[PDB]
RNA sequence: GUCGUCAGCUCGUGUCGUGAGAUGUUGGGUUAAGUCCCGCAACGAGCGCAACCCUUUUCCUUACUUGCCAGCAUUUCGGAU
């Protein structure tokens, strides 16, 4: 599953930020710069992701569910896709605070959730009014939107695999706090210090990060065999 | 009594500060109203608001006197009988 260096190049993580931009901390991933924005190399990104994969892949032997949090409104649809056929939780809209902070809180709004699906499978949605009956479908539509990837996950991740450390910065701070770790995108604007694992490319180009989402969703489906 | 029929008040859990503390109630629409919806280190529960109470507007059921008179009958033509 390893991507083996001519994919990258065609999905063009090569590409980055402009310059004025830059975070002095990726010094050694820049490497230099074709044209005004800056060109990653690639060469400290294969073994990177080889062995962020590697980990996956024995995090996924072991059973540990893994959490997917990338929420770039280019990136939603393709890391749910990914997730959805990886069959781990996910997170593809806004964080919202507290998702592994406190998880205690999240456990009475995830059964409440349930607990309203199971209204809606039943006929008590049908017999309530019209007005309640709205009330509650708009209810539905705005905890499903909330919750929906994580509602199936019943205990903490035991990794985070994020699609863009300094837009997602809350998920990697919590993660810290916590001591979970955190397999990470990166391009040369953010910085990675909290990154347990990095991974340096671009993820601007929806089609970088669909072959970076298909990777890891390969490397979940092989754990497990 | 009055401000004043003014719209605010409280409290549960995590985060930021060495600390007293801050974050919920802030932002944009909307309304009689922190009423309702979009925003977002916040997450939801209570008291205030509203509704539950009395009266008025159309119709239905029970009730037919001491209240009523459409149909009928007698009339000192007055529902008087």
């Known amino acids: 599953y390893n991507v083996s260096m001519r994919?990258?190049?065609?999905?063009?993580?090569?590409?980055?930020?402009?310059?004025?931009?830059?975070?002095?901390?990726?010094?050694?991933?820049?490497?230099?710069?074709?044209?005004?924005?800056?060109?990653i190399n690639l060469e400290h990104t294969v073994p990177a992701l080889n062995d962020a994969l590697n980990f996956a892949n024995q995090l996924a032997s072991k059973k540990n569910k893994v959490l997917f949090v990338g929420t770039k409104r280019a990136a939603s649809n393709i890391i749910r896709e990914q997730a959805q056929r990886a069959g781990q939780p996910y997170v593809d809209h806004?964080?919202?605070?507290?998702?592994?902070?406190?998880?205690?809180?999240?456990?009475?709004?995830?059964?409440?959730?349930?607990?309203?699906?199971?209204?809606?499978?039943?006929?008590?949605?049908?017999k309530l009014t019209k007005r309640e009956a709205?009330?509650?479908?708009?209810?539905?539509?705005?905890?499903?939107?909330?919750?929906?990837?994580?509602?199936?996950?019943?205990g903490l991740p035991d990794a985070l695999?994020?699609?863009?450390?300094?837009?997602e910065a809350i998920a990697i701070k919590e993660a810290k706090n916590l001591g979970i770790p955190v397999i990470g995108i990166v391009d040369t604007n953010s910085n990675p210090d909290n990154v347990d694992y990095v991974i340096p490319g671009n993820d601007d180009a929806i089609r970088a990060v669909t072959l970076y989402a298909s990777a890891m969703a390969d490397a979940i489906l092989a754990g497990k065999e």
């Open 94 to 126: 806004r964080w919202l605070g507290g998702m592994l902070t406190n998880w205690k809180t999240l456990r009475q709004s995830i059964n409440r959730l349930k607990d309203l699906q199971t209204q809606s499978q039943d006929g008590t949605f049908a």
């Open 7 to 39: 994919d990258l190049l065609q999905a063009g993580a090569h590409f980055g930020h402009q310059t004025r931009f830059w975070n002095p901390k990726m010094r050694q991933y820049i490497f230099g710069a074709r044209n005004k924005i800056h060109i």
């Open 134 to 154: 709205l009330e509650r479908t708009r209810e539905m539509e705005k905890l499903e939107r909330s919750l929906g990837g994580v509602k199936n996950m019943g």
């Open 161 to 167: 695999f994020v699609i863009d450390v300094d837009h």
